């Protein structure tokens, strides 16, 4: 068993427009194995309803989920995906990049 | 529609 | 008819000490999911997860909750086998995975059929395209094969994959006429972002496109890149559409040489756009 790291990209379902709501996307691919945990933050505090597709796979075997939330995005406002998985030695963090 | 795997490996 | 495929994807994971392995599969329709089996719940059901689907009769989903129930069992002992077959050290979470189901072009026939394994998140047997043979991906594998050829069961997915699954391929893209087969087309775009005193970087945006298959790459003056390209994956709105980018670090004063190309089924023409 060969563990394959999590490729993480966090971004809106639509173009960005501060104070215009909006869902901000943490769409997690490529690893193995699938026990995964993904959670979104904003401004550093736990999102609490967050919802996630069911995991499935691609072609490649490699598992995939996507976790999602309602945001408004602001210009002070931040917010970032955080995963924990086995093939990493920590939990890893990316911040929404309205430029990403 | 689901197909079940006819065998054991 | 246009190409469309009917495709599950399976999953078992072991969790020794703690209860029976989780089981999921779930069916797409092209890019579109439309049903699932969770293990993870009081009274597991096969379930619809597309809107399409919700007026399919109760007879549908007691006899797919059947498939998915007996299909449930069988992954259970083959964690066992495969575990017992490699020689692995007990306790330990293990996967075994199934994909499967049929592709077609522009008739009712069989473009393509599947019906591939994988233990551990990789190959451990799979049907051969002439749906009469198996590729076993190791030594491990060959005992399976041999007992799949002595059993015939090359004939029993053959019969699924050229029937069966054509046949529901057919009636769920009818159910679901309406989301199934169209094609939204991306709509393009490039921004420009400072990066040093020497140059920036120009990303060539791709939004709200169906299907998911898409080109998109950058050129200097008619040719592809002698240069690095940051290409992301495809990756899903939430909305049933897709978005993808293509970033190129440029010297300052010379944006105007590079041009982001978009091909998609979707498109009259190829785009081509210029800061």
Redesign the interface.
């Known amino acids: 068993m060969i563990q394959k790291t999590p490729q993480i990209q966090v971004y809106s379902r639509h173009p960005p427009e501060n104070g215009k709501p909006n869902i901000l996307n943490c769409y997690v691919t490529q690893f193995h194995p699938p026990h995964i945990e993904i959670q979104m933050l904003k401004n550093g505090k736990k999102i609490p309803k967050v919802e996630m597709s069911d995991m499935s796979f691609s072609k490649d075997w490699s598992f995939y989920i996507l976790a999602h939330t309602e945001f408004t995005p602001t210009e002070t406002d931040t917010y970032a995906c955080r995963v924990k998985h086995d093939s990493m030695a920590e939990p890893k963090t990316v911040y929404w990049d309205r430029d990403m | 529609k689901y197909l079940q795997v006819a065998s054991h490996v | 008819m246009g190409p469309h495929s009917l495709r ?2 399976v ?1 078992a ?1 072991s969790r020794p000490g703690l209860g029976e392995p989780r089981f ?5 329709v092209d890019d579109t ?1 439309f ?4 293990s993870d719940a009081d009274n597991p059901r ?1 379930e619809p ?1 597309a809107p399409w689907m919700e007026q399919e009769g109760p007879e549908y989903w007691e006899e ?1 909750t059947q ?2 129930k ?2 449930e069992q ?1 992954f259970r ?2 964690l066992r ?2 575990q017992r077959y490699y020689n692995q050290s007990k306790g330990g ?3 075994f ?4 189901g049929c592709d077609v072009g522009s008739d009712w026939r069989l473009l393509r059929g599947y019906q591939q394994f ?1 233990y ?4 451990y047997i799979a049907l051969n395209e002439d749906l009469k043979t198996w590729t076993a991906a190791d030594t491990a594998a060959l005992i ?1 094969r041999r ?2 050829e002595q ?1 015939g ?1 090359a004939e ?2 053959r019969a ?1 994959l050229e029937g ?2 054509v ?2 391929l057919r009636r769920y893209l009818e159910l679901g006429n309406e989301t199934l087969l169209r094609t939204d087309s991306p709509k393009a775009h490039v ?1 420009y ?1 400072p990066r040093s005193q020497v140059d920036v970087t120009l ?1 060539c945006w791709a ?1 709200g496109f169906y299907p998911a298959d898409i080109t998109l790459t950058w050129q200097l003056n008619g040719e592809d890149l002698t240069q690095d390209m940051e290409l ?2 495809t ?5 049933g559409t897709f ?1 993808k ?1 293509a970033a190129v670090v440029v010297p300052l004063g010379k944006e105007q040489n590079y041009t982001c190309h978009v091909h998609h089924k979707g498109l009259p023409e190829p785009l081509t756009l210029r800061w």
């Open positions: 599950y994807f999953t994971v999921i599969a779930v069916g797409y999911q049903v699932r089996f969770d096969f997860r797919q498939r998915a007996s299909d069988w002992v083959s086998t495969a979470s293990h996967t995975q199934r994909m499967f994988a551990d998140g990789r190959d399976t007992k799949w059993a069961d029993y997915y699924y069966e699954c046949e529901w921004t972002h990303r939004l992301v994956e990756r899903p709105a939430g909305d978005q980018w």
